[PDB]
């Protein structure tokens, strides 16, 4: 897929949502809450554990897949 994620018809807005979750996880106030609380908050927002794991993975400064979110 890379740039073109096969969604319902167009690209799936999964990446922009994960990007939003990364901003959330990098927030000072948010970082003060227990890990379980941060994950659960993202789950209630509609993200899956797979997407949350990806958000945590990109919340530092890394990119295992050469594309850069």
């Amino acid at each position: 897929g890379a740039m073109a994620t096969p969604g319902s018809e167009n690209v799936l807005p999964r990446e922009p949502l994960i990007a939003t979750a990364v901003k959330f996880l990098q927030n000072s106030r948010v970082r003060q809450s227990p890990l379980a609380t941060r994950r659960a908050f993202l789950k209630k927002k509609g993200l899956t554990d797979e997407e949350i794991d990806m958000a945590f993975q990109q919340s530092g400064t890394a990119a295992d897949e050469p594309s850069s979110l």
Binding site: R29, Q32, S33, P34, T37, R38, K45
Partner: peptide, 15 residues
């Protein structure tokens, strides 16, 4: 909708 309501709900509730 913006994420502000959520973030604020988040740390205010888990404060």
């Amino acid at each position: 909708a913006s994420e502000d309501e959520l973030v604020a709900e988040f740390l205010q509730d888990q404060n």
